[PDB]
Write a protein that binds this ligand. Structure first.
Ligand SMILES: O=C(O)c1ccc(C(=O)O)cc1
Ligand SMILES: O=C(O)c1ccc(C(=O)O)cc1
Ligand SMILES: O=C(O)c1ccc(C(=O)O)cc1
Ligand code: FES
Ligand code: FES
Ligand code: FES
Ligand SMILES: [Fe+3]
Ligand SMILES: [Fe+3]
Lengths: 129, 409, 154, 384, 154, 154, 382
C-alpha cells in the first residue's frame, strides 16, 4: 500500500506513536518517508544476509524472522512478512520495541540522516489529527 | 466366602456376587455361550447373496456368519487353526474363501481348512510332517438355525431345535412381528457400564417397564385403556412383555407426529418386547421395530447392538412414521434412554455388598406367565434358565441338609 | 455469500448453547421445517436413514428438550464441544452446504472425562432475516458406539 | 505370600500390602466396614433439614442427611430391592429418597417407606402377603459429629468418636474447628497409588522438609503426636518472592503453632498451615488408585481481608500446592519403584521402633503407628 | 473493536508459550494487577472463590514459575492446548469480556496421553502499548478431578 | 503474501482429505521436491533425522498411499484431526514457516476412540501458480508412543 | 485342565492359556526376567560420558544404566532401599550421584547407598538406630555385559558370560552388523496390544515373513536359512513405485546377505534389512500388552548419501513400516482370535518337532526353540 502523508500520520497517532519515548508524531512520519517512501511493501536486501522490511524498514537480523537471515534474534517475535502488510500494527508494535532498546530512533539511519533535529512537525501539518 | 452361593431352590434371592465373580464369568462362556443355547448372529437379509459374511460374537468367542452358493447360511469360530489369529478382519464383506493374513491358511465358507501355505515344504525342505492332515484342524463350527429370518448359532450339536428352544408361544410372537420381509434402516451400538445379566434382567423387567409406561400416560399422550401380561417359556429363559387395547371397546407435545402411527397387526398389541436367552431381543413399540443383540465384554461391561427395521413394502409415509418413532428407542430413546444407565446404578450400588442378595418377590416365587406386569416372573425365569445351564441348582450337600429328616408325611 | 467465518461463529454459538445446558435455545438454531439426525459413518455410507435422534421439524427438537427436562432419567453430565474449521462444498448469497469436524467430551458430575463422540456435521444453511440458520444438520459420528446413553444432542 | 509381616514391630512393611487384591477386599470388610470412623462431610455442608451429600466409606457409597430433629443420619446408598444407587446427586435437599429403578422410597434414616405396586395393579401381581417393608433396607451407619466434622461407622462396637480420637487429637481438632467454618472451594486429586501410600505420606514427618524444598530453596521446634491406637497423628511446628503477600498472615490461634497436620484413621486429614485451613478425605478406588477430596475452609466470621489471605495462602496446598504438589506424585513413585519387589520390605526405622509421640520430626513414629492400627484391624499382628 | 480473531491469536500465543515450557513468558500475558484462577464448574456455580492457583498480581504468577523451576518435584510432562473460538460478551477498542473453550492434553515423558482438563477461560482483556493483555483469566474446569497433580498452569 | 487465513483453510482441506480416506489427494498438498516426516519431540530436540514416515519427494507420498491400498494389512480405522490455529514463525514476501497444533483421534471400525497422536506441524509453505503448497511438513508428535501401528499419515 | 498344561515333551503344541494366565506371567518375572537371562538395556554409545544414564526395564522391574569415570557401565534396580520410590525420574541425563526425591537418600553410580538424610537425627533427636548400617541397604545390582556396544543386564550370579549365553554363531552374526561405531538416528516406541511372547514368536517366525508381508514377496524362496542356538532362545533368519529410491541401496556386507534378523531371549532384536539397521527391545507391560522400543542406527562413518538411503529405507520398518506395520497388529489378531479358546493349543509342526538350524525358512524351528528355552527357565519341561 502507498500511504498518503496525512493518512499515515492519523494511523500512527491511532497506534499511540505521538511522543512514544519522547518522539513527536512528525518524527515517525518523517522516518517512514525516508525509510520506505510510505510503502508498506518496501524491502531492502543488505550485503550481510539481512533485509529491511516495510514502512519502517525493520531489520531481519535483530527484530523480525524472515527465515533466510543467519543469526536471527527475532526480538519483536514476529515473521518479517507481518511487517509487509497494508495494516501498520505489527510494524508499530515492533518500532515501539526498537525505540525502547536504548538508542531511540537512531536505529533508523534515514531518520538520522534526513529527519533528526529538523522541523519534523512540518510532516504532520495540513492533516486532520 | 463364596459370593455366588444361592440362598435356596427359589429365585426370589440372587447373590450379588454373580455380577462380579470372574471365575463364574468364564464358566458362563463354557456353560452358556458355548453350551446348549442359541446365540443371535444376524438377519438372513443382511447376508442375502453368496459370499456375503458378517463377523460377530457368541459370548466372548468371535464368529463368522456367511451365505454360500446353496443359499444356506453357515457359521464358525473366527479363529485360525494354526496359531489362533482372527481369520476375517472386516465387520462385513463378500468373499469366495476366508484366508488368515498371518500364514495364508485358507478356509471355505463352512470353516473347513482347505489350504496350508507351504504344506509340502519348498525344494523338499520343511512344511508339515507326513502325519499332518488338514481335515483334522479347523475352528469350531456352529449349528445354524434360521427362524423368521433370524440367524442363530450353537456350539452344541445337542441343543434342542430352535422351535423347541423357543416353544410355540414365543415362536408365534416372533412370527407376528417378522411376518413379511424386513429392511435394516439403521445400526447403533450402546456400550453398557454393567455385567450383561443386569441388562438382560432389565429387558425382562415388566415391573420397571410398567412403572415407566404408567409415568408416560401422566402426559395423557394416548388416553386409551390397556391390559398387559408377561409370557415365560417352560425353561424360564425367554419372555414376552406386552400391552394391548381391546379393539372395539367404547371410550403437551408441540409435534404430536412423534406418536402418530398406523394399524398394521391383526390385534390390539401396542407394545411387545420379546427376549430369547441369552441375549436376543425383538421389539415392537407402535410401528417401531428393532432387534437387539446383547454381548458380554468384561465382568462390568456389555455391548448392546441395535438393528432398526422397516418392512420392505413400507410407503414413504409409513417409513417416515418409523423414523419418527425411533426417537422412543435406542441410546437417546424417550423410553429406552435410562435402560443404558440402571444396570450401572446396580453395578455401583452393590460395590460394598458382594455377599448380599437381590430381592425378586414381585408376583410370588413363580417363573410362569401372568396377567399384568407388576411381577418379576420373567426375571426369576432368567435365573431358572441360568442356574440350569450353569449347574447352580441345589446340589448334593445342601439338598441333603434340607432333606435329611422324616416329617409326619 | 455465506462464508467459513460466519459458519464458524454460528458453530461456536451452537456449541456454547449445548455445552451450557441452555438447551431451550438449541431449536432456535434451526428452520421451522429443518432436519436434524445423529447417525454414524456406517449408516451414512450404506444410505440408512434412521437416527439415534431424528427430527423433521423445529417443534420435534423443542419436544426432545421438554422430554430431557421433565421425563428422562440420566446421571448428571455435561458436554465440551471442540470444533474444526468448516469447509463449504456449494452455495450462494443465502444457501450453503458445509461440513464441520467435531469432537464432544463427556464430563460426568463425578469427574470422568471421555471422548464421547467425534465426526462431522453435514449441514445445509439458509439465511432468514439476514441471520444464518440450519435447514439441515446431520451429526455423522465416527463411531457406531455410544457409551451408556445419549441425553443431550450433538 | 507377599503380605507376610517379618516381625511384631513395624520397622519392616511388606510391599505386597500395596498390590494384593484379596488383602484389599479384607480392608473393605475389616477397616472401612469395621471398627473405624469414616469422614463423610462437614455439618456446615448439610446445615438444614433435608440437606444431603453422597460420598463413600471405602468402596461403599453412602448417603449423609440432616433431618428435622437437627440430627445427621447416614446409610448405604444401595436400594434393598435389586441394589441400585438410591441418591444419584453429589448434594441436594429432599423430603425422602427414591430409587429411580422401581420407585422404592426411603426416609432420611434409610428405612423403606414405600414400594411401587406393593399391592399389585388392578388387583394383579405385587408383593406376597409375607413381604414386610420394615425387614428390607440399606445398612444404616452410626453417625458421630465432632466440632463440625461428620463421621460414619458400620460397626455397633466402634468406640465413641471422643474415645476413638483420644484426648490429644480431640484438643488439636477443637483448636482449629473452635468456631463455624465455611467451604471456600472443593477439588479432587486422583492419585495413581494405593490409598495407604498417601495416608503414610500425610503421617511422614521425615519427608516434610526434603520432598517439598519450598521454604529451604527460598529455627522453630516441632513434634509428632500419636494416639494410643497408632492410627491418628499430629505433626506440628511453632515459633526471593516478588510478591511476599503469599505468606503474609494474621494471628488467630492462642498458641504460636504455624503448622498443624492431623490424621484420623483411615482417611481423614485436618490441616492448618498459617491461615490456610482445609479438610481432606482419602478414599480407596482400585488396588493402585485412590481419591483425595479437598474441602478448603474459611471461618464464617472472616473479614474480606482475612478471607483474601486464605485465598492467597491456598497456593501452598492442593493439586498445585507449593508444598503439597509432590504429595500427589510420590505415592506413584513408590507404586512403580516396587513393581519388581512385591516380595521385599519397606524400611521404617527412623526414630526407632516406637509408635508414640516425639519431640522433633526426623522420625517415622506416626508411619509405624498407622501400621500398628492397620495390623490390629486386619488381624495381622505378630507377638513380641 | 477487539474481535474474535484477535482474541484467538492471543489465545494461540498463550497456549504455545505454556505448551513449549517457555513458562518464564507466561506472566507477560497478564497486567500487573491481574487475576488468574484455576477452578471448576461446581465452585463457579456455588460462587466459591478458591483456586488450585489463585493470583491477584503478575508478580504472584512470576513466583509460581520460579517455584516450578527451583522447588517443585514432578514427573516430566507437557501440555497440548486445543482452543475453541471465543465468544465476546462486551467490549470496545481497548477492553473485552470473552469466554474461550479449551481442552488440555497431558503427555507424560513416558508416552501416555490423557485429556487432563477441559472447560472455558472467562477473560477480561485490556490493551497495553497496542497489545491485548489479560486483566483476568478464570480457567473454569469442567471436571472437579485433577489427575495426580497440576504443575503447569492452564 | 502467505497469511494465517490461507494456512487455516489449507490445514482444514488437508485434514478433510486424510480423515475421509481420499488419501489419493494427500500428495497434491505438497511440492514435487517436498519433505514430509512423522517424528516426536525427543528426536526433534536431539536433532535425530529419522521418521516413522520419511519422504523427500511427492512420488514417495504417492507410493505410501499405493502400499496402503494394495499391500498393507491393518485393521480398518479412521482419523479425526482437530487442529489449532497456525502461527507464522518466519516469512518474507513469498515464503513462510508456520507451526500448527494438532490432535488425531483414531476410531477403530469396532468403535473404540483413542487420542492416537498430538503435536505440531512444523511447515514450510510456498505459493506456485496460485496454489499454497507444503515444501515441508514435519509432524512432531508429543508422544514417543504409537499405539499398535500407524497406517494413515498424520 | 490347567490352561497352561503342556500336552507333550516337544513344542509342536503350545497351550493358548500361556498368553492370558496372570500367575504364569508373575512366574515369568521371577524365572525369566530376574532369572538366568541377559536383558537388553541400551547401547554404550547412548551413554558415552561419565555420569550419562538412561532408565529402562528388565521385564516389569525399572532399571538405571550409567557410565562411571572408569568408563565402565553399571546397572541397578530403580528402587530406593528406604520405602521403594523410583530413584531416577528422567528417561536420561547426566549426574554425579542419584538422589531419591522422597527423603533425599543418595546413591553412587553403582547403586550403593551413600547418604541418608538426618541419619544421625536433628539436634538431639530422631534419626536411625545405632544398629542401622547404610552398607546393608541398596537396590539389587545387575551384572552388566557389553557385546559390540550392546549393554545387557542380569539379576543372576549364575547366568553364563554374554559370549556363552549368545553362543559363537549369534556372537559372529551380531559382530557382522555391529563391526564399526554406530549412531542413533531416531527412537520410536510401538505399544503392542498383545502378550510379549506373541511378538517374540513373530520375530522368530520365518514361515510368516513372505506371507503376512506382500512387500517381502512382491518386490524381493531365496538362499537363506534359520539358525537356532543350543538353548533354543536365540535365532537368526537370513536371506540373499514412482520413486524406486525407497529400495535403492548400496553394498556394505561381505556375504550377499540382504536380510538378517537376530533374536536374543527374552526380548532383544538386531535387524539388518538392506541398509536399514535397528535394535528392538521388547518389554512385557500387562498380560495382553507389550512395548517395542526401536533404536534406528546409522554408522558414524556414513556419507550424506548413505545416511539418506537409510532414512528412506526406514519406511520399511517401525510403526508405519511397509514390512513391520503388520507385525504390530498380528499379535493382537491372535490375542483376540483365542478369546474363547484358553483351553486349546497352537499347532507348530512346520519343519517337524526340531529346535535346530535349517537350510529353508518354510519351518517353525526357531519358534519351537523359543518354547524350549521358555519351558527350561519356567520349570515346565515334559
Ligand atoms: O428393554 C425395553 O425397552 C423394555 C422392556 C420391557 C417392556 C415392557 O415390559 O413393557 C418395555 C420395554
Ligand atoms: O501431606 C501433607 O500436606 C503434610 C504432611 C506432613 C507435614 C509435616 O509433617 O510438616 C506437612 C504437610
Ligand atoms: O521382525 C522382522 O522384521 C522380521 C522377522 C522375521 C523375518 C524372517 O525370518 O524372514 C524377517 C523380518
Ligand atoms: S495363524 Fe492363521 S495361518 Fe498362521
Ligand atoms: S432397584 Fe431400587 S427400586 Fe428396584
Ligand atoms: S523412599 Fe527414597 S528416600 Fe525415602
Ligand atoms: Fe507434605
Ligand atoms: Fe514380520
Amino acid at each position: 500500500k502507498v500511504f498518503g502523508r496525512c493518512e499515515l500520520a492519523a494511523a500512527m497517532k491511532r497506534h499511540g506513536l505521538d511522543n512514544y519515548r519522547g518522539y513527536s508524531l512528525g518524527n515517525w512520519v518523517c522516518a517512514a518517508k525516508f525509510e520506505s517512501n510510505f510503502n508498506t511493501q518496501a524491502t531492502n536486501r543488505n550485503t550481510d544476509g539481512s533485509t529491511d522490511y516495510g514502512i519502517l524498514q525493520i531489520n531481519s537480523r535483530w527484530w523480525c524472522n524472515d527465515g533466510r537471515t543467519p543469526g536471527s534474534r527475532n526480538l519483536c517475535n514476529i515473521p518479517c512478512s507481518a511487517l509487509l502488510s497494508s495494516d501498520i500494527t505489527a510494524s508499530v508494535n515492533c518500532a515501539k520495541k526498537i525505540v525502547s532498546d536504548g538508542n531511540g530512533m537512531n536505529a533508523w539511519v534515514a531518520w538520522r540522516n534526513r529527519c533528526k533535529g529538523t522541523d519534523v512537525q512540518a510532516w504532520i501539518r495540513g492533516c486532520r489529527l | 466366602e463364596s459370593i455366588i452361593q444361592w440362598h435356596g431352590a427359589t429365585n426370589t434371592r440372587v447373590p450379588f456376587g454373580i455380577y462380579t465373580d470372574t471365575a463364574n464369568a468364564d464358566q458362563e462362556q463354557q456353560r452358556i455361550y458355548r453350551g446348549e443355547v442359541w446365540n443371535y448372529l444376524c438377519l438372513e437379509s443382511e447376508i442375502p447373496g453368496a459370499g456375503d459374511f458378517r463377523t460377530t460374537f457368541a459370548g466372548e468367542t468371535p464368529i463368522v456368519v456367511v451365505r454360500d452358493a446353496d443359499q444356506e447360511i453357515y457359521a464358525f469360530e473366527n479363529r485360525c487353526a494354526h496359531r489362533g489369529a482372527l481369520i476375517a478382519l472386516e465387520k462385513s464383506g463378500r468373499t469366495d474363501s476366508f484366508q488368515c493374513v498371518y500364514h495364508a491358511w485358507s478356509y471355505n465358507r463352512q470353516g473347513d481348512l482347505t489350504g496350508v501355505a507351504f504344506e509340502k515344504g519348498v525344494k523338499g525342505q520343511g512344511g508339515m510332517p507326513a502325519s499332518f492332515c488338514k481335515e483334522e484342524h479347523g475352528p469350531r463350527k456352529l449349528r445354524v438355525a434360521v427362524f423368521c429370518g433370524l440367524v442363530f448359532g450353537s456350539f452344541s450339536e445337542d441343543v434342542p431345535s430352535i422351535e423347541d428352544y423357543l416353544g410355540p408361544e414365543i415362536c408365534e410372537r416372533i412370527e407376528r412381528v417378522l411376518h413379511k420381509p424386513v429392511e435394516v434402516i439403521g445400526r447403533f451400538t450402546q456400550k453398557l457400564p454393567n455385567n450383561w445379566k443386569l441388562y438382560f434382567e432389565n429387558v425382562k423387567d415388566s415391573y420397571h417397564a410398567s412403572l415407566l409406561h404408567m409415568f408416560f400416560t401422566t402426559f395423557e399422550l394416548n388416553r386409551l385403556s390397556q391390559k398387559g401380561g408377561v409370557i415365560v417359556d417352560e425353561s424360564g429363559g425367554h419372555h414376552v412383555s406386552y400391552s394391548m387395547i381391546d379393539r372395539g371397546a367404547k371410550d403437551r407435545l408441540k409435534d404430536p407426529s412423534l406418536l402418530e402411527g398406523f394399524e398394521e397387526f391383526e390385534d390390539g398389541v401396542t407394545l411387545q418386547i420379546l427376549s430369547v436367552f441369552p441375549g436376543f431381543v425383538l421389539q415392537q413399540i407402535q410401528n417401531s421395530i428393532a432387534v437387539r443383540q446383547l454381548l458380554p465384554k468384561s465382568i462390568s461391561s456389555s455391548e448392546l447392538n441395535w438393528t432398526y427395521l422397516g418392512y420392505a413394502d413400507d410407503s414413504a409415509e409409513q417409513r417416515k412414521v418409523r423414523l419418527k418413532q425411533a426417537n422412543l428407542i435406542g441410546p437417546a430413546g424417550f423410553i429406552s434412554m435410562e435402560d443404558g444407565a440402571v444396570g450401572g446404578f446396580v453395578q455401583r450400588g452393590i460395590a460394598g455388598a458382594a455377599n448380599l442378595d437381590a430381592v425378586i418377590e414381585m408376583g410370588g416365587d413363580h417363573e410362569g406367565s401372568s396377567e399384568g406386569r407388576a411381577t418379576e416372573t420373567s426375571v426369576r425365569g432368567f435365573w431358572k434358565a441360568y442356574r440350569k445351564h450353569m449347574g447352580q441348582e441345589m446340589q448334593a450337600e445342601n439338598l441333603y441338609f434340607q432333606g435329611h429328616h422324616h416329617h409326619h408325611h | 455469500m455465506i462464508n467459513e467465518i460466519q459458519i464458524a461463529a454460528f458453530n461456536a454459538a451452537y456449541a456454547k448453547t449445548v455445552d451450557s445446558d441452555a438447551m431451550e435455545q438449541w431449536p432456535t438454531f434451526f428452520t421451522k421445517d429443518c432436519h436434524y439426525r445423529v447417525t454414524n459413518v456406517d449408516n451414512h455410507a450404506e444410505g440408512l436413514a434412521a437416527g439415534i435422534v431424528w427430527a423433521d421439524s423445529q417443534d420435534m427438537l423443542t419436544d426432545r428438550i421438554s422430554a430431557l427436562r421433565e421425563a428422562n432419567i440420566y446421571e448428571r453430565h455435561r458436554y465440551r464441544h471442540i470444533l474444526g474449521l468448516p469447509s463449504i462444498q456449494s452455495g450462494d448469497a443465502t444457501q450453503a452446504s458445509a461440513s464441520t469436524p467435531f469432537m464432544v467430551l463427556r464430563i460426568m458430575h463425578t469427574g470422568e472425562t471421555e471422548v464421547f463422540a467425534s465426526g462431522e456435521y453435514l449441514d445445509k444453511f439458509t439465511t432468514i432475516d439476514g441471520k444464518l440458520r440450519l435447514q439441515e444438520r446431520i451429526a455423522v459420528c465416527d463411531s457406531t458406539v455410544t457409551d451408556t446413553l445419549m441425553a443431550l444432542p450433538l
